[PDB]
Design a protein around this ligand. Structure first.
Ligand SMILES: O=C(NCCO)Nc1ccc(Br)cn1
Length: 147
């Protein structure tokens, strides 16, 4: 499987950092604090594809942790999920790990492949969790490539 290391920033230009072991949060960051941002390994996985819709998995660089979409208290919910480090990443990722990376107006949205029309989202407020949203909440991102 092919993977690229990258960071993400929301359309309000908030960066993403760890919020405990299994959550991410978004906040405005600049300067030395930039080292705190999460670096993703974006893997290009199997799934239905178009020019503007590309299936990816979002793992944390050098960690056996992936973003995943599951029902929690009966609601679609973004979680960080651990995996066996000997088996990942792989080309045929389970559907809960797959996001459709969609380019619209020079920004990216990440739609859950498991839950159509649910998107990786951030709040306008500082220091709040990254979540799966189904308006005020931000669903557009840019990507920064990392060496
Ligand atoms: O401009 C970007 N990065 C800033 C320099 O690090 N990224 C970018 C641009 C278009 C789309 Br679509 C997604 N990401």
């Amino acid at each position: 499987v092919r993977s690229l290391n990258c960071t993400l920033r929301d359309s309000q230009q908030k960066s993403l950092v760890m919020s405990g072991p299994y959550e991410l949060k978004a906040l405005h960051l600049q300067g030395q604090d930039m080292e705190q941002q999460v670096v993703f390994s974006m893997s290009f996985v199997q799934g239905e594809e178009s020019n503007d819709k590309i299936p990816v998995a979002l793992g944390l660089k050098e960690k056996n942790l992936y973003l995943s979409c599951v029902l929690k208290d009966d609601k679609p919910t973004l979680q960080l999920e651990s995996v066996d480090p000997k088996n990942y990443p792989k080309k045929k990722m389970e559907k809960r790990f797959v996001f459709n990376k969609i380019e619209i107006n020079n920004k990216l949205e990440f739609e859950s492949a498991q839950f159509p029309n649910w998107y990786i989202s951030t709040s306008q407020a500082e220091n709040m969790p990254v979540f799966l949203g189904g308006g005020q909440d931000i669903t557009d991102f840019t990507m920064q490539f990392v060496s």
